[PDB]
Design a protein around this ligand. Structure first.
Ligand SMILES: Cc1cc2nc3c(=O)[nH]c(=O)nc-3n(C[C@H](O)[C@H](O)[C@H](O)COP(=O)(O)OP(=O)(O)OC[C@H]3O[C@@H](n4cnc5c(N)ncnc54)[C@H](O)[C@@H]3O)c2cc1C
Ligand SMILES: Nc1ncnc2c1ncn2[C@@H]1O[C@H](COP(=O)(O)OP(=O)(O)OC[C@H]2OC[C@H](O)[C@@H]2O)[C@@H](O)[C@H]1OP(=O)(O)O
Length: 529
């Protein structure tokens, strides 16, 4: 007999909903462990100025509770961090979840016992307990990556990663530097430039940013959207990227040059990064000719916006438009401010961090009070590999992942019976809340089957998992995404394996795969009583 039916790790969107399903809906005994001092995941940790959703707020929320969709108000087109956090706190209150979420608790070990067919979890505080089922909602974008830049530990001021931003830090009137220009670093830059006495941006790789279109919502428009949420969510769950817009079915090069310009400009004016990539034409990320056209449009905007042509040049990417789409309010415009400087680390790399700042290879010591690492995450697999997570035969998860992280269907793992993953390796690449929902709901159904039928283990086969790897690789190779150097394929961290880590088929196809597996008697699973 285990201590609990189930243990959930993580109290982000994922673990919150998992706890609700397993405790409230199924009536199991459940505990969540979260290493943070508060619930919210991303939206707890990322307290930096400018932190916000790039999913439009209307669909950056749960959908499973229709009354909550009716009731809950948003007032800005995108949601700032404190607003997403307050939403998640409200959900935890609504479903009486806080009583079974244990904060400040890092799980350091999770070990399957093949004799009792139970999981044993160990906390950093030195406690252990057992459960029948283990759900890891560890986050795809949660394990901070802080590069080992020479001299980093000598810096005498406030040195922080964005995912560890301290609530008390006020950068107003300070000399601030930021390393990194992905989604985090760019939205930070926009906010920080308005506060800092001087902002220095250390940019290794410029990205193709488009407008977000953010601003206030008309409350009459929020009421209309609420009235139409059924249809809105149907469209979301059937789409590829789940961002709440209709995805184009038109090949970019099938129209005239003027029509292509007009479509790109309409999207630019409407805002949203995924809208630019997938709402314009159907083949931006698959057809190099189409991709070139999209990239050219954005470069031409950069050239129009940025007044200093050297600064414009340094901001202008020349690689494939196939990193995760970025958007912001007034990003390129920020570089027209007198108090913002841009350092191209291609041209003048960092030589050394020093007590007073950062020294680049031109010998210039950039003096800083605050140095901000917007350097991203050990994405997807980082918190799995960090854990002492062992399955059958006492084998660590790392022994299974020597050519990249793997799963069956994004949510289970061969050799790890009764372990379910929320946004594990090789799952969907979308607006994440509705993918989380698909996964939580699927996992809930399988766990309930186990309960009703008296199953002691559920596990995927090694063949099924290999087949899923091949499926993901095949889909990924039909796209330009593998040729974009970013965190999505592991390439961002030195020594990390370059490998497919997402199913790139989209949410609608992903939901069908899950459904087809379940309706076919859990094709690929060994179910034992
Ligand atoms: C700044 C930022 C903005 C983003 N904006 C968007 C957006 O607009 N749209 C979108 O679709 N996605 C966005 N994302 C991705 C975002 O993480 C997801 O949308 C969603 O918040 C993921 O929820 P989750 O529960 O899967 O993971 P997370 O919110 O990452 O939560 C996982 C939690 O697990 C905890 N944890 C991990 N390991 C352990 C352990 N061993 N023991 C105990 N606790 C542990 C972590 O502390 C963390 O709190 C963004 C990410 C960032 C960083
Ligand atoms: N050693 C070193 N030196 C200099 N610069 C470095 C270094 N390591 C990383 N970086 C840069 O930091 C940035 C990290 O971006 P990203 O991984 O997208 O992380 P984000 O947090 O912005 O976004 C991740 C996701 O969170 C939410 C949403 O899905 C986002 O995509 C990027 O500009 C990197 O440049 P590089 O040269 O490109 O590697």
């Amino acid at each position: 007999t285990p201590d609990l039916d189930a243990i959930v790790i993580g109290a982000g969107f994922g673990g919150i909903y998992m706890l609700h399903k397993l405790r409230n809906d199924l009536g199991l005994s459940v505990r969540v462990f979260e290493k943070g001092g508060g619930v919210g995941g991303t939206w707890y940790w990322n307290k930096y100025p400018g932190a916000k959703s790039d999913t439009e707020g209307f669909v950056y929320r749960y959908s499973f509770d229709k009354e909550l969709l009716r009731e809950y108000d948003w007032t800005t087109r995108y949601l700032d961090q404190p607003d997403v956090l307050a939403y998640l706190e409200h959900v935890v209150e609504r479903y009486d979840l806080a009583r079974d979420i244990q904060l400040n608790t890092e799980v350091t070990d999770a070990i399957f016992d093949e004799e009792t067919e139970l999981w044993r979890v160990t906390t950093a505080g030195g406690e252990t307990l057992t459960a029948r089922f283990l759900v890891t909602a560890l986050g795809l974008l949660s394990r901070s990556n802080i590069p080992d830049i020479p001299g980093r530990d000598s810096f005498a001021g406030r040195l922080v990663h964005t995912n560890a931003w301290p609530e008390d830090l006020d950068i107003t009137g300070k000399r601030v530097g930021v390393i990194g220009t992905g989604s985090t670093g760019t939205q930070f830059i926009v906010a920080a430039a308005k506060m800092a006495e001087q902002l220095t941006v250390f940019q290794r790789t410029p990205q193709y940013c488009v407008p977000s279109g953010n601003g206030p919502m008309d409350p009459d428009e929020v009421a209309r959207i609420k009235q139409n949420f059924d249809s809105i969510w149907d469209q979301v769950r059937s789409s590829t990227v789940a961002f709440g817009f209709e995805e184009s079915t038109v090949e970019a090069m099938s129209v005239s040059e003027s029509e292509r310009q007009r479509v790109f400009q309409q999207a630019w004016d409407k805002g949203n990064g995924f809208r630019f990539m997938f709402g314009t034409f159907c083949d931006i990320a698959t057809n190099p000719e189409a991709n070139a056209a999209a990239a050219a449009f954005i470069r031409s905007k950069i050239a129009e916006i940025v007044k200093d042509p050297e600064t414009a040049r340094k901001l202008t990417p020349t690689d494939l438009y196939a990193k995760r789409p970025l958007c912001n309010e007034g990003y390129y415009e920020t570089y027209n401010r007198d108090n913002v400087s841009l350092v191209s680390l291609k041209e003048t790399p960092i030589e050394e961090i020093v007590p007073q700042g950062v020294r680049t290879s031109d010998g210039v010591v950039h003096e800083l009070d605050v140095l901000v690492f917007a350097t991203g995450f050990d994405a997807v697999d980082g918190n799995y590999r960090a854990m002492n997570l062992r399955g059958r035969d006492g084998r660590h998860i790392n022994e299974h992942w020597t050519e990249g992280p793997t799963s069956y269907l994004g949510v289970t793992k061969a050799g790890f019976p009764n372990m379910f993953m929320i946004l594990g390796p090789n799952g969907p690449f979308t607006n994440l809340p509705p993918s989380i929902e698909a996964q939580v709901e699927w996992i809930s159904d399988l766990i309930d089957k186990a309960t009703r039928e008296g199953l002691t283990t559920v596990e995927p086969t090694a063949d099924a998992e290999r087949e899923w790897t091949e499926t993901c690789a095949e889909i990924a190779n039909m796209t330009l995404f593998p040729k974009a150097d970013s965190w999505i394929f592991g390439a961002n961290i030195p020594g990390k394996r370059h490998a497919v880590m997402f199913y790139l088929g989209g949410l609608g196809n992903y939901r069908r795969q899950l459904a087809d597996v379940a309706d076919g008697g859990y094709r690929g699973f060994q179910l034992r009583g």
